[PDB]
Write an enzyme that holds these catalytic residues in place. Structure first.
Site, PDB file in Angstrom:
ATOM      1  N   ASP B 113      47.066 -13.420 -23.972  1.00  0.00           N
ATOM      2  CA  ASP B 113      46.039 -14.434 -24.057  1.00  0.00           C
ATOM      3  C   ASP B 113      46.379 -15.964 -24.775  1.00  0.00           C
ATOM      4  O   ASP B 113      46.403 -17.061 -24.203  1.00  0.00           O
ATOM      5  CB  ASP B 113      44.739 -14.098 -25.143  1.00  0.00           C
ATOM      6  CG  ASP B 113      43.876 -12.963 -24.461  1.00  0.00           C
ATOM      7  OD1 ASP B 113      44.490 -12.449 -23.440  1.00  0.00           O
ATOM      8  OD2 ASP B 113      42.700 -12.686 -25.335  1.00  0.00           O
ATOM      9  N   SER B 227      29.767  -1.120 -37.190  1.00  0.00           N
ATOM     10  CA  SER B 227      30.098  -0.829 -35.877  1.00  0.00           C
ATOM     11  C   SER B 227      30.305   0.543 -35.319  1.00  0.00           C
ATOM     12  O   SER B 227      31.122   1.156 -36.028  1.00  0.00           O
ATOM     13  CB  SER B 227      30.698  -2.066 -35.127  1.00  0.00           C
ATOM     14  OG  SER B 227      32.179  -1.627 -35.028  1.00  0.00           O
TER      15      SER B 227
HETATM   16  C1  FMN Z   1      33.601  -4.682 -33.084  1.00  0.00           C
HETATM   17  C2  FMN Z   1      35.121  -5.162 -32.750  1.00  0.00           C
HETATM   18  C3  FMN Z   1      35.114  -6.309 -31.791  1.00  0.00           C
HETATM   19  C4  FMN Z   1      36.558  -6.673 -31.443  1.00  0.00           C
HETATM   20  N1  FMN Z   1      36.444  -7.579 -30.514  1.00  0.00           N
HETATM   21  C5  FMN Z   1      37.772  -8.233 -30.251  1.00  0.00           C
HETATM   22  C6  FMN Z   1      37.931  -9.191 -29.008  1.00  0.00           C
HETATM   23  O1  FMN Z   1      36.777  -9.829 -28.463  1.00  0.00           O
HETATM   24  N2  FMN Z   1      38.958  -9.705 -28.805  1.00  0.00           N
HETATM   25  C7  FMN Z   1      40.196  -9.294 -29.156  1.00  0.00           C
HETATM   26  O2  FMN Z   1      41.292  -9.848 -28.999  1.00  0.00           O
HETATM   27  N3  FMN Z   1      40.030  -8.379 -30.188  1.00  0.00           N
HETATM   28  C8  FMN Z   1      39.072  -7.701 -30.597  1.00  0.00           C
HETATM   29  N4  FMN Z   1      38.878  -6.529 -31.749  1.00  0.00           N
HETATM   30  C9  FMN Z   1      39.927  -6.422 -32.681  1.00  0.00           C
HETATM   31  C10 FMN Z   1      40.427  -7.519 -33.554  1.00  0.00           C
HETATM   32  O3  FMN Z   1      40.794  -8.864 -32.992  1.00  0.00           O
HETATM   33  C11 FMN Z   1      41.372  -7.323 -34.770  1.00  0.00           C
HETATM   34  O4  FMN Z   1      42.429  -6.876 -34.088  1.00  0.00           O
HETATM   35  C12 FMN Z   1      41.020  -6.228 -35.905  1.00  0.00           C
HETATM   36  O5  FMN Z   1      39.966  -5.569 -35.674  1.00  0.00           O
HETATM   37  C13 FMN Z   1      40.824  -6.900 -37.214  1.00  0.00           C
HETATM   38  O6  FMN Z   1      41.496  -8.278 -37.198  1.00  0.00           O
HETATM   39  P1  FMN Z   1      42.319  -8.446 -38.628  1.00  0.00           P
HETATM   40  O7  FMN Z   1      43.826  -8.068 -38.149  1.00  0.00           O
HETATM   41  O8  FMN Z   1      42.301 -10.157 -38.770  1.00  0.00           O
HETATM   42  O9  FMN Z   1      41.637  -7.783 -39.795  1.00  0.00           O
HETATM   43  C14 FMN Z   1      37.533  -6.296 -32.164  1.00  0.00           C
HETATM   44  C15 FMN Z   1      37.452  -5.170 -32.989  1.00  0.00           C
HETATM   45  C16 FMN Z   1      35.963  -4.547 -33.264  1.00  0.00           C
HETATM   46  C17 FMN Z   1      35.854  -3.515 -34.597  1.00  0.00           C
END
Ligand code: FMN
Lengths: 318, 349
Positions: B113, B227
């Protein structure tokens, strides 16, 4: 001729952005069982003269709430934007509505917006062409893979793939001779704008036809669009006075380098404004000048809602 | 107790993109009837891991088709789009839906991305941080200006104004201590991961609450979400098989998305995002995660979720049902959750 509506969504001190958005939605709901075929959304940033900067997002909403009308961006400005975002979004709209979205697009009309988003003005036209090339590759194949001075990244599937084979139908804002020529060579339909003079729109219409002939492009089935403002009142002088006030900031923002009174006077006599008689006569003249097969109208300068609906009904009826 | 429905727009190889898109549309419309207050939309680009790359626009569509249903992003990849364009989109959603948009944000999981949209994944945390301030400044003041290290632009009027005071409610997908603290300093609700356990959830919350309390936030009035991958079936083992098979596929699809540009020409085009780059680079399988998710009989689902509620005090439960097969089998799974799980969950004593 097919006929539709567009939304400029102009605001002022007494008519908040909240209010005009609500107006547009109510208007979309009102005309959806009528014979208007398109709802089109104007893009503007950073001023009262249009509170919608993301016409594809508004398009999604309108498509979710309506069932009959096609929904279009009127002038989605691709030059200042990432074409992968555009293609993604337009294909998403294509898919979610199962083919009720039409993609109207535009080059950038304010250099201030180019600078804001760091797009160089010296190369604005080639940037525009490259943006459209990526969007069109995605529409037609599901993929893009630019390797040029503006965009260079590896081959990607642009998701979701279009629902409509070839992507949503396209049309381009007639904003310069350069764009008009580009479009003619591609066989793309134009939208002519309400705020251009009849002479200007005629010049663009003629340029188009001639570039097309010169290049062997069959444009015989190309449906150009025209937009016009509509304000009808049996008191024709009241219609002009009301449109005047509505249009004033716009003329000062978008035609600052041209004489105020002369340009206002022209917008008021050339748009479908005045008595029913005056109004429809200006429409006939405007269509004859540019050769547009489809007419898009904005009724938004009529502040009295009940009056506005009455004119929409009369227009619908003929 | 609030309930959310997660929509991944995941493409299994036997479905076409068109069919996956029809399921998004249909499952969004089915959600309210099944007792869900909110539909949450994941963002993903370029790959079958998820076909929706623009949740603002898909939220517009579902919000347009609905009246009282809330729609949120879980999550917008904040850094990879211009903060002023995103503020316009949020306000527009906020205005058109009259306050039913929920703005979930993350730093972004996939370099592809950042690669295509032309910004730096090594800088994702500082960009998410800066973009948030600029957006919230626009939501609050009606104007945004930037003169910083990451981005600079003159002051602009932001259109339209926010329907919701302070802008549409923001949620943070968080699963590092640093993103937890970032969210806590702002008083913002988190959406907790479905791959961590009760003990991990409680520890992330205790951390959050420490920082949030120091700022003066009421930690009991913050809309944190649990979730879940969810598969409710009277046949416990069939539910586990369905979910175990899905988690394998989705994980492989996650891996494939991380490697997509693996051997490619690294040459970038024009730098429209000059202040966004850093000079330097920065310095796990989920096969058994159905054991810590509501996957099994209603009773088993009730106990797993009540255990999380009891340890965390969360009363907003967001469930993903798309492991469950055909559109018909997903809806039936939602309906059994609605009838046999929803009414028996209770808020923490
Ligand atoms: C409910 C949920 C939704 C997520 N949605 C996305 C998303 O839309 N795009 C993406 O690149 N990662 C998504 N992830 C992962 C997050 O971007 C990220 O890697 C991590 O779960 C938490 O971020 P942090 O490293 O700042 O703590 C999602 C994770 C969860 C649990």
């Amino acid at each position: 001729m097919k006929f539709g509506l567009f939304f400029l969504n102009f605001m002022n001190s007494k008519r908040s952005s909240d209010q005009v958005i609500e107006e547009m939605l109510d208007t979309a709901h009102y005309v959806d069982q009528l014979k208007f075929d398109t709802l089109a959304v104007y893009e503007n940033h950073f001023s009262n003269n249009g509170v919608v900067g993301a016409p594809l997002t508004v398009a999604g909403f309108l498509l979710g709430m309506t069932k009959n009308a096609k929904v279009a961006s009127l002038n989605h400005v691709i030059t200042t934007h990432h074409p992968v975002r555009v293609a993604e979004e337009a294909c998403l709209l294509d898919q979610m509505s199962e083919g009720r979205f039409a993609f109207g697009f535009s080059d950038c009309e304010k250099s201030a917006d180019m600078r804001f988003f760091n797009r160089p003005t010296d190369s604005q036209f080639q940037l525009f062409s490259e943006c459209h090339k990526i969007i069109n590759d995605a529409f037609t194949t599901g993929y893009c893979h630019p390797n040029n001075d503006f965009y260079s990244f590896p081959k990607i599937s642009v998701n979701p793939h279009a629902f409509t084979e070839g992507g949503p139908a396209q049309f381009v804002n007639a904003t310069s001779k350069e764009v008009v020529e580009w479009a003619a060579k591609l066989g793309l339909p134009l939208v002519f704008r309400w705020d251009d003079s009849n002479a200007q729109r005629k010049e663009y219409a003629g340029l188009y036809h001639e570039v097309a002939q010169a290049h062997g492009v069959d444009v015989s089935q190309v449906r150009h669009k025209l937009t016009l403002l509509v304000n009808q009142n049996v008191d024709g002088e009241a219609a002009r006075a009301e449109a005047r006030v509505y249009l004033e900031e716009f003329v000062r923002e978008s035609y600052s380098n041209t004489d105020f009174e002369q340009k206002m006077g022209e917008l008021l006599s050339e748009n479908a404004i005045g008595t029913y008689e005056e109004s429809t006569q200006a429409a006939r003249v405007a269509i004859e000048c540019c050769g547009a097969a489809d007419l898009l109208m904005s009724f938004e300068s009529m502040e009295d809602k009940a009056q506005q609906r009455a004119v929409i009904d009369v227009v619908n009826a003929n | 107790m609030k309930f959310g429905n997660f929509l991944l727009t995941y493409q299994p190889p036997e479905l076409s993109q068109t069919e996956v898109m029809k399921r998004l549309v249909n499952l969004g419309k089915a959600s309210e009837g099944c007792g869900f207050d909110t539909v949450w939309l994941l963002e993903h680009h370029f790959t079958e891991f998820g076909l929706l790359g623009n949740p603002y626009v898909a939220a517009a569509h579902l919000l347009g088709a609905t009246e009282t249903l809330n729609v949120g992003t879980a999550a917008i990849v904040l850094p990879t789009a211009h903060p002023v364009r995103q503020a316009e989109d949020v306000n527009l959603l906020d205005q058109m839906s009259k306050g039913r948009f929920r703005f979930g944000i993350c730093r972004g999981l996939y370099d592809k991305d950042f690669r295509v949209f032309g910004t730096d994944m090594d800088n994702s945390r500082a960009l998410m941080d800066c973009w948030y301030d600029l957006m919230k400044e626009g939501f609050n003041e009606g104007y945004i200006a930037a003169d910083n290290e990451h981005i600079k632009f003159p002051k602009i009027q932001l259109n339209p104004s926010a329907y919701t005071q302070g802008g549409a409610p923001v949620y943070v997908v968080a699963e590092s201590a640093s993103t937890t603290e970032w969210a806590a300093e702002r008083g913002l609700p988190m959406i907790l991961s479905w791959i961590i356990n009760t003990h991990e959830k409680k520890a992330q919350l205790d951390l959050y609450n420490e920082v949030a309390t120091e700022h003066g936030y009421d930690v009991t009035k913050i809309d944190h979400c649990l979730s879940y991958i969810t598969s409710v079936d009277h046949d416990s083992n069939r539910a586990k098989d369905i979910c175990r098979n899905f988690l394998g596929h989705w994980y492989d699809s996650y891996v494939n998305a991380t490697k997509i540009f693996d051997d490619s020409d690294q040459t970038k085009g024009y730098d429209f995002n000059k202040g966004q780059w850093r000079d330097f680079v920065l310095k796990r399988r989920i096969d058994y995660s159905y054991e810590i998710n509501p996957v099994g009989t209603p009773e088993e689902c009730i106990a797993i979720i009540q255990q999380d509620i009891d340890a965390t005090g969360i009363d907003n439960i967001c469930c993903g049902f798309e492991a469950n097969g055909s559109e018909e089998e997903i809806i039936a799974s939602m309906k059994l959750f609605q009838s046999d799980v929803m009414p028996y969950l209770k808020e923490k004593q």
